[PDB]
Scaffold this active site. Structure first.
Site, mmCIF file in Angstrom:
data_model
loop_
_atom_site.group_PDB
_atom_site.id
_atom_site.type_symbol
_atom_site.label_atom_id
_atom_site.label_comp_id
_atom_site.label_asym_id
_atom_site.label_seq_id
_atom_site.Cartn_x
_atom_site.Cartn_y
_atom_site.Cartn_z
ATOM 1 N N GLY A 5 -28.573 9.171 -47.940
ATOM 2 C CA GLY A 5 -28.517 9.110 -49.385
ATOM 3 C C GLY A 5 -28.172 10.455 -49.992
ATOM 4 N N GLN A 6 -27.976 10.437 -51.306
ATOM 5 C CA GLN A 6 -27.670 11.593 -52.142
ATOM 6 C C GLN A 6 -28.762 12.667 -51.997
ATOM 7 O OE1 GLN A 6 -27.495 11.909 -57.154
ATOM 8 N NE2 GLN A 6 -28.821 10.325 -56.303
ATOM 9 N N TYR A 32 -36.879 -3.141 -57.694
ATOM 10 C CA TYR A 32 -37.032 -1.805 -57.201
ATOM 11 C C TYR A 32 -38.248 -1.107 -57.863
ATOM 12 C CZ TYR A 32 -35.785 3.157 -56.638
ATOM 13 O OH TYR A 32 -35.735 4.513 -56.419
ATOM 14 N N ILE A 39 -30.743 11.636 -61.302
ATOM 15 C CA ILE A 39 -30.378 12.819 -60.522
ATOM 16 C C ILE A 39 -28.852 12.990 -60.457
ATOM 17 C CG2 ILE A 39 -30.545 14.005 -58.319
ATOM 18 C CD1 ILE A 39 -33.195 13.511 -59.723
#
Lengths: 321, 321
Positions: A12-13, A144, A174
């Site tokens: 992921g990022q 989520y 983010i």
């Protein structure tokens, strides 16, 4: 005299940039990073050593890795996030609920300081959307979000019951220059920067005055290390709001246009992200994090935009200036 | 023109009495009831027809039963509750988190109106303990509580996403004459009635002035049927506080002594229940339930005590008067 750090969901990022920052601070054989697939050919940590394949739903393989590497810190980062979760809820529940339970059990069994991120997605429309508090009503409208309320509460119970050193922040939006823009809730922001650099039309799915809490990646990385370094006695809680600054799409546009002196052609056309974003806070109260462990922010929106407009051509070869 | 009703976890306290009340109101071949074990020899529905063995962790057997019986209503009642959950948390998570997910999927797939109870255990010490609201901070200190916050939120998401008609109340302490007293959070109450009838010493593990919301079983049964009968349009929410009345142990003692004119020898000696109870509300605001669907209470503490002191000798053969 340094931690041994396991990162899961490392592609992921956040996972990618964190992995590299941890390697640089603690040395690369002090850090093991894993994810369910291998790094794509041009991915920032393709080729590197101490990156592994691991399905966190494979609880034996998960324990086998922890057993062999002997972490003292674990950043447990896999998650199906807000937009994708609404399309694949089975996977969001499996990942965000089951692997969290395994991860906490391992943190307990193997004496690991465990970071599991939560999210502003754990809030919904009853949260008090201005300067949202650490403790308030949690009525998330996404699966989520629902799973992250459970993660907060479950981690906290593990702490109280078993002494598991569970630590978490509610991540705001983010922003980083590595991310590619798709359909994530806050992806309009990154699409906007690309639109500006390519001088092409930007169709923005978040409405112009919908504010959200946001932060730029370097500040995030800093706080994620810093909350893990804190001694346990400085922490009055397990889960902390953190923010950098809030903006709406019109404000971001303004910042970018100010740096480039070029007007972006923007059409605001509501998409799936809007209804989600509108259920989230405008801004967070992160004063507990500031007071307990020194959460700090160096970037404002214009410093961020300057850096983003400089990095994206470098990292993705878009046109510069 | 009547519902077909599946009850799971039917051997519990609520499940037993509900099953019998549903049978009596809708006829016994309109009602199927199940639980993971067979009814003990002297259990109120031992011998009866349309009671089944089913492990709700067996998701295929669960679907097979729903497939064959074709319920239009389901009361999904299995739960590892607050005290036992702290001793067997793996089982509380499996039952309260996994079987809930299966049950909701089945309610979706098979078009079932689904009741899953929550609990005052979903609250903790930040809830606002006086006249606790429907919407407030949820910081439960038990794993059972943690799983019920998730059940509330997950059910609600199923409603919004898939149109699953999910309905729930936060059960207060539930008193009934059938229950036997062990170590459950509110079991001191039932122990107290037995102590009075046997004229023996009562060691009470909840402190004398620790108030909790409570209700007597007939009122509970009434509200559980009534929330399921309501048309969907009358419901402004999926999860409702319900209460009868609040009492502390000293108040219950007072009520019992008043009916018997005999003083119970009571020693208040703190046990595991106290710390849990102290994190729970003193009383609930159930005005949403009153307004939306007519939640009503016939019993006060003295009517309840009169009935309890009359029933317990009948049902368990203790001495009477």
């Amino acid at each position: 005299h340094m931690p041994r750090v396991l990162v899961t969901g490392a592609l992921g990022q956040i996972g990618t940039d964190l992995s590299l920052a941890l390697r640089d601070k603690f040395g690369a054989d002090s850090v093991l990073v894993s994810d369910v697939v291998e790094p794509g050919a041009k991915h920032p940590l393709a080729g590197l050593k101490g990156v592994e394949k691991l399905d966190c739903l494979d609880s034996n393989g998960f324990e086998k890795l922890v057993k062999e590497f002997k972490p003292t810190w674990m950043y447990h980062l896999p998650a199906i996030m807000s937009v994708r979760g609404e399309a694949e809820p089975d996977l969001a529940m499996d990942i965000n609920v089951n692997t969290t339970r395994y991860a906490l059990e391992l943190a307990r069994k193997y004496n690991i300081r465990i970071f599991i991120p939560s999210t502003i997605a754990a809030f919904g429309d009853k949260c008090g959307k201005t300067m949202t508090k650490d403790d308030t009503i949690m009525n998330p409208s996404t699966v989520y979000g629902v799973t992250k309320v459970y993660t907060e509460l479950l981690g906290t119970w593990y702490r109280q019951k078993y002494g598991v050193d569970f630590r978490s922040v509610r991540l705001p939006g983010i922003i980083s220059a590595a991310t590619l823009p798709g359909g994530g809730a806050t992806d309009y922001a990154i699409h906007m920067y690309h639109s500006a650099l390519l001088q092409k039309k930007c169709v923005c799915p978040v409405l112009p005055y919908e504010s959200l809490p946001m932060m730029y990646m370097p500040d995030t990385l800093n706080s994620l290390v810093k909350i893990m370094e804190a001694p346990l006695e400085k922490l009055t809680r397990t889960v902390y709001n953190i923010t950098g600054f809030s903006f709406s799409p019109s404000e971001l546009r303004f910042s970018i246009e100010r740096c480039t002196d070029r007007t972006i052609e923007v059409e605001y056309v509501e998409g799936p992200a809007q209804k989600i974003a509108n259920s989230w806070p405008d801004s967070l109260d992160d004063s507990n994090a500031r007071n307990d462990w020194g959460h700090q922010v160096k970037y404002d929106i214009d410093m961020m935009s300057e850096d983003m407009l400089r990095q994206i051509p470098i990292l993705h070869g878009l046109p510069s200036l």
